[PDB]
């Protein structure tokens, strides 16, 4: 049983594989929340800390780019690299007081989006140089809409040198080459970067529209892998599952069998979080500065405008959303 | 001329010193907004890059442990210390990014309190033996209701840790007694006692701010000239002031007390109510926030990921704030300072 599961903040390195081997063994995906303030960096942690589970959580090129504020120029990565950087150091230093394990992310890199990576891993770099871990536990690549060579060749080119660090490294082929992804171009990508290092995911194109989802299609791989390495591993492969909402649970089953580890899906979250705060319209009456329906023609509207209040609703149909995706992919109650 | 007006991000020891003594010089003060988010930073940061103006940011304890989440127990005030910490890295990570000095502050902090002090200064001192600096620029101790000697005691010890640090303490006092305004005597005892330790302090007296009495911010006009002729000097502010909760106080009361030397002026409803309008008035979206089903266009085959993306609808609030600190900035003829 390893050491990962009874830590509590970000975690790095081998406690990332560890952890990710741990969900292959025991049959679980770990979800990932894209988090755009600390207000859903909440939420998550809260929810993985009452169902006493691991969580991701990963910034998009644009919830990064939020968390550094909308009104910072972003024409060249700037607002991204500098806001991943705050929610980083945010993350961090709040994240051990949930007393979970937390895998800390990025999400989707396409090759014009290329700067602000480069500025996360010089980031990384200099904080590894000073501390002995990176920053970020994790980060992906999506150059699925290159050619696979092409895809391999960068992704393999950034693995060595995240490879300095321990760090993870996500990667999404699609179906481009040079429909779904074969699993003979699957076993390219572990090829190349397996010479490297072994820490790396694989997100594959099964359908997962982000015309119908083939989550066995990810077993195919596993196989084709395992007779390829000449090992009995069920699992060569750390697979991701990215969006396609409204999979079942039977889908998701499948997928988890078949190894993935992580599930993306972020739209669910997004509406989540809005159901709590809107449904706070039906306070309308109470919400401005001073009149209220209630008493008062005259009353302090503050007990109810306080965005401590409300926003608290968001995160509270954020957090038990999430809880549903914990039990779902069975990562509740795993530590 | 002072550095401290170029700078960007955070700033610590003699900037603070700088900034407030630059206020008191061209008549100005600074509001002081509290955060409770990344969300209400990036508000705040903004208005005050967009109207080229410093600002103060800080967490109450509530808003620190807002910071944490309301999922983290408080008992023994974990929450207010993690979140605090927690914030004081993220705000120290993207101030830099706007381009202006900030002074990271605390609130009210009293008696019962102050194990959520405790717990910041512990780790302000790791972070200053790490860097150089500590974690907060300055720190507010509010033991106004505790007796008066009793307070500048507990004050005075603090005071001599956070000065090896150069950290700044605003400390509040009232009307108590021990052995209705702050009396200029009382303001006096204060200065007397926290001016041996260091120069990096300010003080909140009782002048009718409410949170009988009436808003009188002429008695901080003779807070300096007790000061002034009790200590010798002939510059006009001897001391720092600082204008909490100020209710709805017209222009001229405002006035009043920046030109008698206040340089820091915190109301908090306002903001707050601010933020809120914003994401309030996306109730004229109503209709298309219910997941993939839009009355507009087509149910159940136009999704409304677009709108009930949280990255549009908070901005909104975000973008109320700071027309309300932008028009905050310009009531305290802080707009424009650098
Ligand atoms: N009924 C149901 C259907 C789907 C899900 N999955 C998620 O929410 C999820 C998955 C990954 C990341 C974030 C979330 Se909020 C949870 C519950
Ligand atoms: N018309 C008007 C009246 C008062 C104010 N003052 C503020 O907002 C304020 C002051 C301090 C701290 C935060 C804010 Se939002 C601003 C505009
Ligand atoms: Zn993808
Ligand atoms: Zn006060």
């Not at 990962?4 to 970000?10: D, N």
Request: proline share 5%.
């Amino acid at each position: 049983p390893p050491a990962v599961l009874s830590k509590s903040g970000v975690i790095y390195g081998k406690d990332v594989k560890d952890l990710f081997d741990y969900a292959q063994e025991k049959g679980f995906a770990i979800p990932a929340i894209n988090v755009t303030s600390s207000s859903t960096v909440v939420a998550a942690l809260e929810a993985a800390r009452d169902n006493k589970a691991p969580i991701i959580l990963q910034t998009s090129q644009g919830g990064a780019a939020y968390f550094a504020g909308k009104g910072v120029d972003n024409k060249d990565q700037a607002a991204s690299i500098a806001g991943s950087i705050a929610a980083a150091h945010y993350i961090r230093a709040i994240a051990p007081t949930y007393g979970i394990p937390v895998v800390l992310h990025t999400d989707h890199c396409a090759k014009k989006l290329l700067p602000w990576f480069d500025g996360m891993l010089k980031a990384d770099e200099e904080f590894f140089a000073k501390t002995g871990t990176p920053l970020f536990s994790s980060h992906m690549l999506d150059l699925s809409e290159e050619t696979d060579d092409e895809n391999i060749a960068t992704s393999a080119k950034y693995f060595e040198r995240m490879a300095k660090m321990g760090q993870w490294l996500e990667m999404e082929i699609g179906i481009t080459g040079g429909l779904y992804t074969s699993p003979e171009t699957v076993f390219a990508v572990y090829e190349s970067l397996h010479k490297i290092s072994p820490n790396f995911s694989i997100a594959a194109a099964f359908g997962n529209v982000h015309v119908q989802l083939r989550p066995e299609i990810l077993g195919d791989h596993q196989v084709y892998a395992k007779k390829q390495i000449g090992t009995d591993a069920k699992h060569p492969l750390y697979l991701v599952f990215h969006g396609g909402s409204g999979s079942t649970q039977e889908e998701f089953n499948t997928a988890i069998k078949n190894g993935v580890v992580k599930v993306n899906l972020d739209t669910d979250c997004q509406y989540a979080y809005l159901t709590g705060i809107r449904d706070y319209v039906t306070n309308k009456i109470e919400y401005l500065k001073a009149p209220v329906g209630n008493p008062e023609g005259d009353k302090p509207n503050k007990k109810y405008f306080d965005p401590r209040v409300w926003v608290r609703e968001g995160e509270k149909t954020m957090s038990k959303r999430i809880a549903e995706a914990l039990d779902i992919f069975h990562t509740k109650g795993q530590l």
